[PDB]
């Protein structure tokens, strides 16, 4: 990219998120986050990093949205809570009127080129939707479907996702759009999503079947303490067998470690995370 090149507008809305999906993106190595922001996208609204504030920030987003109706990308971080008329997530106020996450997704969702549901919360409900919750935390695709909103959704899950999954999915979509236009390009992206809406370049391979400890698993050689790095981690709770992600190869944080080497995989990219992956520390 260049400072002077074409960069599509992006709005980043946080619902019931922890900001971990923003922080993981800040950790991108190649390209760096500076290059992403200055050369790849135009991040027009993002409450954690943007210059302006309050109603002015909301109105700026609305002005860009009108100019780029049908053409902006909408990133959602966190789940969307529907209970109590949306009151468990208020994202802004304008004109003396509060804006819930429910309101915001109904407003901007219909007019986005595509919605990128970043993180397991947005993709599948995640921890805010888990047993013991009471906010009506809802995944993006289900919320949009329930409200008749047909805009395409791409899920980029993980808790958090790896930065390469987020940036790489953006790069994949922008490439498809460059070659085919918006509708043709999004059709090419949909073709490479699995049944859970995830791009197969990043989520098309199972961790366990590619794990360096697979021989130990097949031999029944299991570590009894976390600090034994020779044995397989299955008895300690590893969920690699049920998890579709490429962590075994790209690893984390500049390649310095990953969950299976350090401890166990907790299946964080899967639609049943956390309840279907718990307890974390037994099989």
């Amino acid at each position: 990219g260049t400072l002077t090149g074409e960069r599509p507008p992006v709005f980043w809305l946080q619902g019931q998120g922890c900001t971990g999906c923003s922080v993981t993106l800040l950790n991108s190595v190649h390209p760096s986050i500076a290059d992403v922001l200055l050369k790849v996208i135009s991040l027009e609204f993002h409450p954690t990093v943007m210059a302006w504030e309050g109603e002015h920030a909301i109105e700026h987003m609305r002005k860009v949205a009108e100019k780029f109706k049908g053409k902006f990308f909408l990133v959602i971080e966190g789940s969307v809570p529907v209970e109590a008329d949306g009151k468990y997530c208020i994202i802004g106020e304008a004109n003396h009127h509060e804006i819930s996450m429910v309101d915001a997704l109904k407003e901007f969702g219909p007019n986005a080129a595509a919605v990128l549901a970043v993180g397991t919360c947005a993709a599948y409900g995640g921890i805010p939707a888990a047993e013991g919750s009471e906010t009506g935390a809802t995944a993006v695709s289900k919320f949009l479907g329930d409200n008749g909103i047909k805009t395409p959704v791409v899920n980029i899950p993980g808790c958090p996702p790896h930065p390469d999954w987020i940036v790489g999915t953006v790069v994949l979509a922008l490439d498809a759009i460059k070659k085919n236009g918006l509708e043709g390009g999004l059709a090419e992206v949909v073709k490479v999503l699995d049944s859970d809406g995830r791009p197969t370049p990043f989520f098309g391979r199972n961790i366990h079947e590619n794990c360096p400890y697979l021989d130990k698993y097949d031999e029944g050689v299991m570590s009894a303490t976390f600090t034994d790095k020779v044995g397989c981690r299955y008895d300690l709770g590893c969920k690699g067998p049920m998890t579709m992600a490429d962590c075994f190869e790209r690893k984390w944080n500049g390649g310095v470690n990953w969950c299976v080497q350090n401890a166990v995989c907790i299946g964080c990219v899967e639609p049943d995370f956390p309840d279907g992956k718990s307890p974390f520390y037994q099989a």
Binding site: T19, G20, L43, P47, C89, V256
Partner: protein
Amino acid sequence: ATGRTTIAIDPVTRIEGHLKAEVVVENGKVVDARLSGGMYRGFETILRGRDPRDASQIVQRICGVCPTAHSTASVLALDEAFGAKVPNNGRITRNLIFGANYLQSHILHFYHLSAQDFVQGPDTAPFVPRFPKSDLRLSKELNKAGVDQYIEALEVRRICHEMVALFGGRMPHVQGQVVGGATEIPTKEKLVEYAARFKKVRDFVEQKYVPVVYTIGSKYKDMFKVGQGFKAALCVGAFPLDNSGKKHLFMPGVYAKGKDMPFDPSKIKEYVKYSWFAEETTGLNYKEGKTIPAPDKAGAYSFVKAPRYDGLSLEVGPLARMWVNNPELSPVGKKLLKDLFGISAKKFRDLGEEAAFSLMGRHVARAEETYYMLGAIEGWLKEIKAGEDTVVMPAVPASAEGTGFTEAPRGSLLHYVKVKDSKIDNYQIVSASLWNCNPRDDMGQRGAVEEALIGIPVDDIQNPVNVARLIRAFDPXLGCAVH
């Protein structure tokens, strides 16, 4: 000469999480304030019924900026509840994991959250548009230094997360801290890798970050004269320096009404009159805490509970810890206080109460604390023993309780767990931004930031920049505050 204007800011940006601030301005100054945390998830109810060991993963998702703090408080609570005796080398390894995120978090806060309060960024989103009269006072050269350092800091904070991940597995959301210690013994090779990254971070902190905070501060000397609030602080202790549980890098204490006092955790109570929780749950200590949402309750304005310490409204964070502990100032700080401010100082309290408890004083304290943490990490790198075991594997108890106390980058954090029938019966969290960004208590006394907003200047109601500047000095994360 002017009357009232009431100003609402939602979202407050360049913080973590969902915050609305509403201030009453009369005659050019804030005279009242209300802070509203507008998003709730309910971790304290989600946790119930689970295997207690799961908590040290679940709790980190309270907040992806400070997950190591929640991990630490959780494993300390579980250690106590399980009777787990963490090996000495695991104690040190935990400190290396967590300490690296203090560096990440303070650098993120000053550059990527706060610096745009004083620095104009490049002419493209997300750096524009902004207030037409943003009160950006820096020369062309110093503004450019701020931008150049913002950009460099993006790399430095990423390197800090590589440091976290070396023994923590990944970041955000470490895998490497569990009940009983740390899951990966440091090897000689990975300790080399941690030290090489740490040197780059140290050089940035010493040469760029600490100097730029004092230098920008010297162009905003008026910002040391506002934001005092109650001038009352809390520290609960953090970073155990031996296995006794009695010695910590930051020692506990309370400061209020000009007096140092001991910290007794039994004096914490959480009030809810102005919070969206059932009225019957008001006034509980965390060991008996309850979390019953009431989003329609009349008069309430926040999902943050109102914690009070023996009735006092206190603040937490770097200022609190540095004031309570009064360490020596960094060599850089001493020199620049003299050269740019005409101040002769040796220890942190030599700034004086008024300047320390101020908008810019909180930025200074955070920079000084970052430098202070460098020395702690260097010490742990000398103390750690490559190859020595870092974990024990304790059985889950049927019935137990435990409390973990630490200091997150933004201030005091505790987690309390009660186990019954080998499952979580109650789990209560009292976090840093809870102490700072809470609403009024049942007696009408304001939270720390609400009170620190009193007196903030708003000489231009169309460009009321100092309201959110004050808020950002406290480095709020509303995910932590509400959970």
